[PDB]
């Protein structure tokens, strides 16, 4: 309900896998990260970059 279509929380800059169909597939282990932005805006977060 508040995962993807929250519409009021923040941005969701993501890529690669479908941001809608993953709601059905079930995983075993889910990782959580508490870190800080890379430094400029988001820029250097990109494959091949």
């Amino acid at each position: 309900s508040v995962l993807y279509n929250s519409a009021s929380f923040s941005t969701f800059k993501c890529y690669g896998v479908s941001p809608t169909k993953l709601n059905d597939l079930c995983f075993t282990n889910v990782y959580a990260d508490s870190f800080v932005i890379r430094g400029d805006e988001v820029r250097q977060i990109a494959p091949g970059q």
Partner: protein
């Protein structure tokens, strides 16, 4: 079936009516393929004779 009809897809909060960027995309983009590249990637002649 032909697919001539073109229209910008809308699944988020943005209709993407010429406002590309900031979580907004446009399917048609320029590839920028210079000649001296991986000729193995070159498109081939595909024909179907039903």
């Amino acid at each position: 079936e032909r697919d001539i009809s073109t229209e910008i897809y809308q699944a988020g909060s943005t209709p993407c009516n010429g406002v590309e960027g900031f979580n907004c995309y446009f399917p048609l983009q320029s590839y920028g393929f210079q000649p001296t590249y991986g000729v193995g990637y070159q498109p081939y002649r595909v024909v179907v004779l039903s």
